[PDB]
Short mmCIF file of C-alpha atoms and ligand atoms in Angstrom, two decimals:
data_model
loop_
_atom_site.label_atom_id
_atom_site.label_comp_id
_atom_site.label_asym_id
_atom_site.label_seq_id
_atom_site.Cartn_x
_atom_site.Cartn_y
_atom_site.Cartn_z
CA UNK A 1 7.72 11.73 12.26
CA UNK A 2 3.92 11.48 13.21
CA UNK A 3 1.45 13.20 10.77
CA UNK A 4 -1.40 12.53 9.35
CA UNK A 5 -0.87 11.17 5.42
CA UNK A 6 -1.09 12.96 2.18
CA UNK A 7 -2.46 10.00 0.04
CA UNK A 8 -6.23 9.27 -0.33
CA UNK A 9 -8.10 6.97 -1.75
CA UNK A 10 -7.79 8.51 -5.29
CA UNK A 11 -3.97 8.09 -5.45
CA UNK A 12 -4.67 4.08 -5.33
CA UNK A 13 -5.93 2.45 -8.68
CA UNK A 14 -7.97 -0.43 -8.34
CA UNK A 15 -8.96 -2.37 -5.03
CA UNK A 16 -12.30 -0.95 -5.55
CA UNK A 17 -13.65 -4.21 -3.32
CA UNK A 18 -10.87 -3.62 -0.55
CA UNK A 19 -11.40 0.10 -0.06
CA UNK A 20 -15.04 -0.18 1.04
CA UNK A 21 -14.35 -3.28 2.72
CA UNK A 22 -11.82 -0.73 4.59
CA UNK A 23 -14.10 2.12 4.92
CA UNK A 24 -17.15 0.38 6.32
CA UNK A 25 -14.42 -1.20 9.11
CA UNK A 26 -13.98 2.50 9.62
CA UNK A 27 -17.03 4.28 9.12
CA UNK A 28 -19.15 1.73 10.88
CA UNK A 29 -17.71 2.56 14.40
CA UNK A 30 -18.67 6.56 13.50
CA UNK A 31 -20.90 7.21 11.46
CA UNK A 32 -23.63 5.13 13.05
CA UNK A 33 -22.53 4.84 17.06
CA UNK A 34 -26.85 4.54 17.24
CA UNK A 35 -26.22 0.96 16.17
CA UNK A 36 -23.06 0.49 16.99
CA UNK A 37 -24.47 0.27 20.54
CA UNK A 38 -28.12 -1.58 19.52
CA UNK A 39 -26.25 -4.81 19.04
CA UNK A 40 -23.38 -4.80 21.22
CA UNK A 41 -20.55 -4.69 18.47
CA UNK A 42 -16.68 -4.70 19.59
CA UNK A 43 -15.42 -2.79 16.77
CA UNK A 44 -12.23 -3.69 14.36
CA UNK A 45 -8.81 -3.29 15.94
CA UNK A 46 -6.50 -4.73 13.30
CA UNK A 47 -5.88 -6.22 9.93
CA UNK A 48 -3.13 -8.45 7.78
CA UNK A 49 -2.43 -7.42 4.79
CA UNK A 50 -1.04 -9.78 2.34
CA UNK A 51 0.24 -10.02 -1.37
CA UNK A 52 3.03 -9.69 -4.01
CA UNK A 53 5.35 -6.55 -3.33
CA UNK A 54 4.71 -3.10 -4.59
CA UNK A 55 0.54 -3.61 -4.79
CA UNK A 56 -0.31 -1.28 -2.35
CA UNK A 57 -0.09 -2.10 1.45
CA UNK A 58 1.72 0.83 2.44
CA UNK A 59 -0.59 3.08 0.44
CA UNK A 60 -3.83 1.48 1.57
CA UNK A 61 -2.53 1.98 5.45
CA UNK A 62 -2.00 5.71 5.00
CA UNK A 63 -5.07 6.26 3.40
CA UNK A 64 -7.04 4.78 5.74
CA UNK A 65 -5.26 7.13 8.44
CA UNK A 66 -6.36 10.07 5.57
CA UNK A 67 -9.81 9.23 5.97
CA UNK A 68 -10.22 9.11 9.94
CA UNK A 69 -8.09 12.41 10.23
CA UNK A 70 -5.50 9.95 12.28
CA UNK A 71 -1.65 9.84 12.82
CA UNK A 72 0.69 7.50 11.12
CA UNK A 73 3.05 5.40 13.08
CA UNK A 74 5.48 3.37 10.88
CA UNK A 75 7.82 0.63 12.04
CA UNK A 76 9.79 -1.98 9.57
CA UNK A 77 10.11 -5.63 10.67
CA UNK A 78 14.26 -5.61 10.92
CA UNK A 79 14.82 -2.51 12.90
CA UNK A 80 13.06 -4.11 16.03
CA UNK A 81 16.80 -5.65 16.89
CA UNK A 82 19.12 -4.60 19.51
CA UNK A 83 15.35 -5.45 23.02
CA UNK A 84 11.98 -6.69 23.82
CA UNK A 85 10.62 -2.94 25.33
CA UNK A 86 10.78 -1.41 22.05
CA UNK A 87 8.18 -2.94 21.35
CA UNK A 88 6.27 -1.33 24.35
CA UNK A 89 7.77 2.01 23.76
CA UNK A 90 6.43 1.71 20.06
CA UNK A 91 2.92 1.00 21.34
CA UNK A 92 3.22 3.70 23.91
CA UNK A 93 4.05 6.56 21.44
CA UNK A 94 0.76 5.01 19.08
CA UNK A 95 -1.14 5.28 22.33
CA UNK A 96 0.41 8.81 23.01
CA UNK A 97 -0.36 9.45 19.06
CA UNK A 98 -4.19 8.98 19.34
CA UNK A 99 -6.39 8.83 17.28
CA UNK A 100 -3.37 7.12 14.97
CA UNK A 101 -3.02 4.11 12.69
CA UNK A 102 0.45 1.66 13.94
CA UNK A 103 1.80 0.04 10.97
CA UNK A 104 3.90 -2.67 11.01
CA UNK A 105 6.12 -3.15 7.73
CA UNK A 106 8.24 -5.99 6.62
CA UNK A 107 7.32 -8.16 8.97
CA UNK A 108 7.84 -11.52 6.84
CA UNK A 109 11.36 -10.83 8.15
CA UNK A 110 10.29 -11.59 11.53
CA UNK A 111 8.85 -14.77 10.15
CA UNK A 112 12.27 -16.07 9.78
CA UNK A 113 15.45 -14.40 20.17
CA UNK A 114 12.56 -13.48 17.94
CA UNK A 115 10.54 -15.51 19.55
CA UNK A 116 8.66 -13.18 21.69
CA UNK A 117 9.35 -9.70 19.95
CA UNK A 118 5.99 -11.71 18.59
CA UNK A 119 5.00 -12.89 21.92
CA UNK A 120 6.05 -8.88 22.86
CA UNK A 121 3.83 -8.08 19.83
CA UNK A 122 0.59 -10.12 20.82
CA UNK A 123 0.38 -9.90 24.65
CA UNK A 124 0.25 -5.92 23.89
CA UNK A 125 -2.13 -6.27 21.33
CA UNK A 126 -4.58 -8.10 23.74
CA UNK A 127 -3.67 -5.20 26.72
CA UNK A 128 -5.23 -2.21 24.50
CA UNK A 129 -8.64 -1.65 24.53
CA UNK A 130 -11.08 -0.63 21.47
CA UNK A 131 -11.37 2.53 23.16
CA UNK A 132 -7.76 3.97 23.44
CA UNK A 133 -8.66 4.56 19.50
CA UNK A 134 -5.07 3.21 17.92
CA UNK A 135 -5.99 1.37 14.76
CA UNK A 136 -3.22 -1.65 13.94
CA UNK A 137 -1.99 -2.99 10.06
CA UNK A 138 0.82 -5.41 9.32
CA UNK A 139 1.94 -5.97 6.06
CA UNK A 140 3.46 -9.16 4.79
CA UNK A 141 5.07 -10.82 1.58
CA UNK A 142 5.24 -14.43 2.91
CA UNK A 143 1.88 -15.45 3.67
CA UNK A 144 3.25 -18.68 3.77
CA UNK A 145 5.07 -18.22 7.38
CA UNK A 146 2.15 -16.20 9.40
CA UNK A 147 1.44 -17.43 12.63
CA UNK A 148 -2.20 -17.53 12.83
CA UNK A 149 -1.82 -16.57 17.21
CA UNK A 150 -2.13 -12.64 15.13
CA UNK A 151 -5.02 -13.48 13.49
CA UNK A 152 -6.73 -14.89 16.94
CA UNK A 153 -10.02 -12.88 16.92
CA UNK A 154 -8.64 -9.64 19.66
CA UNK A 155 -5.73 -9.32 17.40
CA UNK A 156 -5.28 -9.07 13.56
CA UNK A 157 -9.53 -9.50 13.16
CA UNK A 158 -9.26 -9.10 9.18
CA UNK A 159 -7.23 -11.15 6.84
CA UNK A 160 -6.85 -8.88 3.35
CA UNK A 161 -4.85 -9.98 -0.04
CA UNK A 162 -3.50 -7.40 -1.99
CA UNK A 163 -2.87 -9.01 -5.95
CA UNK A 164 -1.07 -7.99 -8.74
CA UNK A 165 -3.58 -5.40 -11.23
CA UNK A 166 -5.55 -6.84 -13.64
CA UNK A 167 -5.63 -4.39 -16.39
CA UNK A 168 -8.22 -2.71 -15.36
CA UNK A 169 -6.73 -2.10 -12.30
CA UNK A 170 -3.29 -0.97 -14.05
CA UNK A 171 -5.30 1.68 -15.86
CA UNK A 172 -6.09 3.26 -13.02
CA UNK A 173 -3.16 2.85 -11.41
CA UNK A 174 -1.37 4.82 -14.43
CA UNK A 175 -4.62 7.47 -14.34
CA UNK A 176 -3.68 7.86 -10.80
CA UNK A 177 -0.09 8.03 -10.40
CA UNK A 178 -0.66 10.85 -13.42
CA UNK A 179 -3.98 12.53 -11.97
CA UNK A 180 -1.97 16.25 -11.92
CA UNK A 181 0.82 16.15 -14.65
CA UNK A 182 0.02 17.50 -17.77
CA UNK A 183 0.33 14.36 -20.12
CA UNK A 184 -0.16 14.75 -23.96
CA UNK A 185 -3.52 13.65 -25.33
CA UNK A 186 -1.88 11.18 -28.03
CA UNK A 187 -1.10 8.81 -24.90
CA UNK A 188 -3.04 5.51 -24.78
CA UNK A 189 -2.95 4.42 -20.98
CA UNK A 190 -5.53 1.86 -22.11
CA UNK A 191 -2.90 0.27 -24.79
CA UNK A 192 -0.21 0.14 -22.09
CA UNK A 193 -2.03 -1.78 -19.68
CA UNK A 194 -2.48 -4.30 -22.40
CA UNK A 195 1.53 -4.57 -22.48
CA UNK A 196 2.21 -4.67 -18.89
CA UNK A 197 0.29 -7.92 -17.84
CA UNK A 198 2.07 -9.26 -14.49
CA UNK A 199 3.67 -5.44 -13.62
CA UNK A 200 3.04 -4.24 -10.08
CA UNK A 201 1.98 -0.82 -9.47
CA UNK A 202 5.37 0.03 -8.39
CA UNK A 203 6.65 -1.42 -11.79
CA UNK A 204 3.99 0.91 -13.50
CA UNK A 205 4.90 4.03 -11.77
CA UNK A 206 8.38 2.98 -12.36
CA UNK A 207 7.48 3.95 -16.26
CA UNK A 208 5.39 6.81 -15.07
CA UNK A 209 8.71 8.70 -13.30
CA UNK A 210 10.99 7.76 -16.41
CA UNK A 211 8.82 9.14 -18.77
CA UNK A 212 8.27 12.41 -16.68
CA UNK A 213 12.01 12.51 -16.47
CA UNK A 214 12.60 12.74 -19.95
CA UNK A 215 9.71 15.57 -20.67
CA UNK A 216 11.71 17.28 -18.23
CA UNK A 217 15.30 16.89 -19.25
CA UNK A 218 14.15 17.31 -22.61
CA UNK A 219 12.43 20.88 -21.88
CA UNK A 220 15.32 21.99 -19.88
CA UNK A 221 17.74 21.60 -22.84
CA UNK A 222 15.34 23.23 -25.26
CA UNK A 223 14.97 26.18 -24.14
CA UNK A 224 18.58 26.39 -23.06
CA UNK A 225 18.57 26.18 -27.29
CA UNK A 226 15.66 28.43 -27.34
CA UNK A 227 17.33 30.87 -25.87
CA UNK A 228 20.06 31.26 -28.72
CA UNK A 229 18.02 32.22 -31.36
CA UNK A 230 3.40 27.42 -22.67
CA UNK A 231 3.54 24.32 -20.44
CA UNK A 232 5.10 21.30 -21.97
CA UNK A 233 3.76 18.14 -21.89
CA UNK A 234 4.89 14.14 -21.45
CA UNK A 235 4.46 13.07 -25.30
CA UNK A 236 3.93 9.28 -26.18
CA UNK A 237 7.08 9.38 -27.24
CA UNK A 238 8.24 10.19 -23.52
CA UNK A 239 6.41 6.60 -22.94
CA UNK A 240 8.26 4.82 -26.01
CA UNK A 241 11.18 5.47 -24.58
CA UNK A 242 10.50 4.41 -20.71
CA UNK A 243 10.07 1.03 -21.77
CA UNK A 244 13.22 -0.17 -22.77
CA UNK A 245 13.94 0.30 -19.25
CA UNK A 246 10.82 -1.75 -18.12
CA UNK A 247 10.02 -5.52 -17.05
CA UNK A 248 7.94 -7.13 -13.97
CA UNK A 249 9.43 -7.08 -10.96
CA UNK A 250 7.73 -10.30 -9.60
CA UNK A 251 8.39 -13.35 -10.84
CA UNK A 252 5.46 -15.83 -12.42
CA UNK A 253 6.71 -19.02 -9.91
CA UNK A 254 5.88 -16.24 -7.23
CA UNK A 255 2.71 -15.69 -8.99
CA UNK A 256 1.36 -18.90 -8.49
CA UNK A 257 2.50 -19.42 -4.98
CA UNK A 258 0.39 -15.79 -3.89
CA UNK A 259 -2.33 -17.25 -6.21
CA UNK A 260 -3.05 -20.47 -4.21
CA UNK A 261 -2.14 -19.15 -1.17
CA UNK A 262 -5.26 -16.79 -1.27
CA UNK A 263 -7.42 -19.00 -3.79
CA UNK A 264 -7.25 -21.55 -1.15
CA UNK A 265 -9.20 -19.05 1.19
CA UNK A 266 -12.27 -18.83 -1.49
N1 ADP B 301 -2.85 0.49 -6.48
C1 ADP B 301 -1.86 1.39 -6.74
N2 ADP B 301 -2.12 2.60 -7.31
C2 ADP B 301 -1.14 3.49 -7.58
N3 ADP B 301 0.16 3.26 -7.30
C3 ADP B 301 0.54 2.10 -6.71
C4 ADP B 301 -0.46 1.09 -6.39
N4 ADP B 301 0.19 0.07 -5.82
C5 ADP B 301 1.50 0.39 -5.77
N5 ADP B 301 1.71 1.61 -6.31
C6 ADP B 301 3.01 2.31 -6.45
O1 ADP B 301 4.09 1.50 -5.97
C7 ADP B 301 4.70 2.07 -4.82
C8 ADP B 301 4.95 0.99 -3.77
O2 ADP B 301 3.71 0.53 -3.23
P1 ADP B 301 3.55 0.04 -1.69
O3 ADP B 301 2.19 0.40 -1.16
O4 ADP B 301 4.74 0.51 -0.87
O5 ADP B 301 3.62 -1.56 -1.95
P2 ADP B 301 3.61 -2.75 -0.85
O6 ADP B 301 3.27 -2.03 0.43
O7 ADP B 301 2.54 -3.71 -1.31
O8 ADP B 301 4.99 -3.36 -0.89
C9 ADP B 301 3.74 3.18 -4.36
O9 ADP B 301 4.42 4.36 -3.91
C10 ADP B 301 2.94 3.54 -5.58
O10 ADP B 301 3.51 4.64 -6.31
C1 AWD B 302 14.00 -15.54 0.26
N1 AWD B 302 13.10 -16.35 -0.65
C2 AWD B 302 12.16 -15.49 -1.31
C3 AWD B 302 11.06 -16.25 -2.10
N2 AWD B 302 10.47 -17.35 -1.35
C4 AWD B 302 9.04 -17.56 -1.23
O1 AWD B 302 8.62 -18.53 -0.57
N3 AWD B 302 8.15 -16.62 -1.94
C5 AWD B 302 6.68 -16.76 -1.89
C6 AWD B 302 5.91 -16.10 -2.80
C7 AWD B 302 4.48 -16.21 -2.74
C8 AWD B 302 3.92 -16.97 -1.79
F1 AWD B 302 2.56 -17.11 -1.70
C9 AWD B 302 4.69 -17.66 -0.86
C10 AWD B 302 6.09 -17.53 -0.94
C11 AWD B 302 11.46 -18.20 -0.71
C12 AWD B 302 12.48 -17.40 0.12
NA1 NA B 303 5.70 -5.91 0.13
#
């Protein structure tokens, strides 16, 4: 389907820096075209996003299509198999689809015939113009295996990494993920960040959908007692009970290998 996304900047926690980095690659080209001429500036066409699975890549690509009131084209590394004009008809439909935002997922896989699905990939990239307004993301796990012909300026301009939350960051990823459910006031997001070091923000909304779960199957069978013989809330002891079911996802070898990777670009 091609829509324009639900999710804003508010359903992300954290990645304060990376969201105006993202917004001034955005807002630049529009909000001040009376400079964007005075210097002669080719504006952004595409970025890499990079990091340790579950942080946000996906999220941050629809929200940037939120903010410029764009459509959302998704395609997942694998599924590019059969074969080298589906990539053309993909960038066809994102032309057809503009103002949109093309996202490619998953596309460590490509990594590793496939050869020139990249070279497929690139040469299109360089045969679409500023102006035909299609805005381009890739999202990869294996910053190890990227060939850097995508980040030639003309092609994947901006390299981004995406890390694991600090704990600030999962505080506001559990704030977010919880912005509109009615959540009991004896609940100490502040205290579970502290015992979730090293859990993604898919392994903290993991907890999150357990624990909302449990308010619910618990409500259902109460007043199926009640009625024997006022909206209820996720308790902390909805949350006590989550956790049993809850350890990182990503492993701390992995850690250190995302770690230097990016350290190792200041
Ligand atoms: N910064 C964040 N804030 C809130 N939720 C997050 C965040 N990062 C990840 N999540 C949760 O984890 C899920 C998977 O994130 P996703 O963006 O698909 O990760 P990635 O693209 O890095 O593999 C999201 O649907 C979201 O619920
Ligand atoms: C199928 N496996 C998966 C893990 N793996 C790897 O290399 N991970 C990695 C993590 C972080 C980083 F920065 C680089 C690589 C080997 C192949
Ligand atoms: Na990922």
């Amino acid at each position: 389907v091609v829509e324009v996304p639900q999710v804003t900047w508010e359903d992300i926690g954290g990645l304060e820096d990376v969201k105006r980095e993202l917004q001034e690659l955005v807002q630049y080209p529009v909000e001040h075209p009376d400079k964007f001429l005075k210097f002669g500036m080719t504006p952004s066409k595409g970025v890499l996003f990079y990091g340790p699975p579950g942080c946000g890549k996906t999220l941050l690509a629809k929200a940037i299509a939120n903010e410029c009131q764009a459509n959302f084209i998704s395609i997942k590394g694998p599924e590019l198999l059969t074969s080298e004009a589906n990539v053309r008809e993909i960038f066809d439909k994102a032309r057809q689809a503009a103002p949109c935002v093309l996202f490619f997922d998953e596309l460590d896989s490509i990594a590793k015939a496939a050869d020139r699905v990249i070279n497929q990939i690139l040469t299109e990239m360089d045969g679409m113009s500023t102006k035909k307004n299609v805005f381009i993301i890739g999202a990869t796990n294996r910053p190890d295996i990227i060939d850097p012909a995508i980040l030639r300026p003309g092609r994947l301009d901006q390299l981004i990494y995406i890390p694991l939350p600090d704990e600030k960051s999962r505080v506001a990823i559990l704030k977010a993920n919880l912005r509109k459910s009615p959540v009991a006031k004896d609940v100490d997001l502040e205290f579970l960040a502290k015992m979730t070091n090293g859990f993604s923000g898919a392994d903290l909304t993991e907890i999150c959908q357990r624990a909302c779960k449990l308010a619910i199957r618990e409500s259902i069978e109460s007043e199926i007692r009640r009625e024997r013989e006022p909206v209820p809330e996720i308790r902390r002891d909805h949350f006590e009970e989550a956790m049993r079911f809850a350890r990182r996802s990503v492993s701390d070898n992995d850690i250190r290998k995302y770690e230097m990777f990016a350290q190792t670009l200041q």
